[PDB]
Amino acid sequence: SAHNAYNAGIMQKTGKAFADEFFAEENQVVHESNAVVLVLMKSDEIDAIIEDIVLKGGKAKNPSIVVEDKAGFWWIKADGAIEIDAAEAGELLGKPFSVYDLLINVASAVGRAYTLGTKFTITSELMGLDR
């Protein structure tokens, strides 16, 4: 919510106001963000995952998830991590749906993307550096 929106922060301003914050002194170095960004390619299988997994159990567990419509794909941003279970998606779709079949329409992944069994997870945790 809010902070994970695509048009959040400086992205709301336009014209001279946008340039003033864009060229601000404090915004000339990157700022650490505990967020993750997952992009889902639109399909019959993904539209079912969007409505019934990330926006249902995914948003209940992580209320900070934001899902934006971008014509051809879904733009998902959340704090910490984003999880999708292929076995859960297979029961929802009623067809064989392994974790590799899930990755068919999982495109951009700004974050540490990995798979644990039947679950896909893009997390903000730096594995091999944190923990």
Partner 1 sequence: PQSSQVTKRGLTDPERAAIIAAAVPDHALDTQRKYHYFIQPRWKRLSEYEQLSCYAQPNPDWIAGGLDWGDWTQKFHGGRPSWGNESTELRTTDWYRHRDPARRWHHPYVKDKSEEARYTQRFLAAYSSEGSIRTIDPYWRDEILNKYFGALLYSEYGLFNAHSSVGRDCLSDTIRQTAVFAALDKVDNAQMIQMERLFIAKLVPGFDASTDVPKKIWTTDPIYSGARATVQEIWQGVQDWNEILWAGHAVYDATFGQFARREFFQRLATVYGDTLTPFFTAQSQTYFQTTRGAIDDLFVYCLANDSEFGAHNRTFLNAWTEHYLASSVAALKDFVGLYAKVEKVAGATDRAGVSEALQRVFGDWKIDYADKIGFRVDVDQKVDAVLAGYKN
Partner 2 sequence: DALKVNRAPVGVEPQEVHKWLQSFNWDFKENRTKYPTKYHMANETKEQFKVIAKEYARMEAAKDERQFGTLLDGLTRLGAGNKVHPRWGETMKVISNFLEVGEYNAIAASAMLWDSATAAEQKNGYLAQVLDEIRHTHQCAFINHYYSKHYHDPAGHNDARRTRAIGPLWKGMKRVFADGFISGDAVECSVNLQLVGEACFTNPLIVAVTEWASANGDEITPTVFLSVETDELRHMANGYQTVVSIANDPASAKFLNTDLNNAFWTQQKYFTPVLGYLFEYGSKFKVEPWVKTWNRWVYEDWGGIWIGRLGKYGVESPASLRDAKRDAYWAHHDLALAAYAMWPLGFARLALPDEEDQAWFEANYPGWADHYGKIFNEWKKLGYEDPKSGFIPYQWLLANGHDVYIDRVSQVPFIPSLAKGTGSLRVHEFNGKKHSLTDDWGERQWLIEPERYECHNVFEQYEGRELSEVIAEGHGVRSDGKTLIAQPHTRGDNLWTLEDIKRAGCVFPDPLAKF
User: Which residues contact partner 2 by CB under 8 A?
Assistant: 6, 9-11, 14-16, 18-19, 22-23, 27-37, 39, 41-45, 47-48, 70-73, 100-101, 103-115, 122, 124, 126-129
Rounded least distance, CB 7 to partner 1, Å: 4
Rounded least distance, CB 15 to partner 1, Å: 16
| Residue 97, strand partner residues | none
**DSSP-H helix ranges across the chain:** 16-22, 44-49, 59-61, 86-93, 99-102
Give the span between the Cα atoms of 65 and 112, in whole angstroms.
17
Give the span between the Cα atoms of 114 and 123, in whole angstroms.
8
Picked from partner 2, partner 1, none, the partner binding residue 131 (CB below 5 to 8 A depending on kind) is none
- For partner 1, which is the closer residue by CB, 82 or 130? 82
